[PDB]
């Protein structure tokens, strides 16, 4: 079968695929919005570093709950 797709996991694959994209976009937007540098160069890096083992970092840290919930699901 295919890899990293519906046959491998997430038999529905109709809601989580866009959910992850929209939450990632929201996190990237709010990382720069709550800055007081590079959007895709730092926000995405922080997200991918928090999914696995200033105030912007603190507020992005809330997304670790979503990351662990997604991993458990």
């Amino acid at each position: 079968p295919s890899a990293f797709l519906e046959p491998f996991s997430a038999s529905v694959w109709v809601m989580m695929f866009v959910m992850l994209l929209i939450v990632s976009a929201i996190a990237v937007f709010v990382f720069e919005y709550f800055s007081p540098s590079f959007t895709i160069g730092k926000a995405i890096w922080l997200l991918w570093g928090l999914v696995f083992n200033t105030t912007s970092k603190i507020m992005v840290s809330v997304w670790a709950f979503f990351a662990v919930i997604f991993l458990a699901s």
């Binding site: 529905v12 809601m15 959910m19 939450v23 105030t55 603190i58 507020m59 809330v62 919930i69 699901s73």
Partner: peptide, 29 residues
Amino acid sequence: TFENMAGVFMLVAGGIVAGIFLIFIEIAY
């Protein structure tokens, strides 16, 4: 899909919104 996916999506969205709102009001205050 059905009730479970919608419920978990709403729960995580509400948690994220509450966290970002708390951070925003803390920064503003």
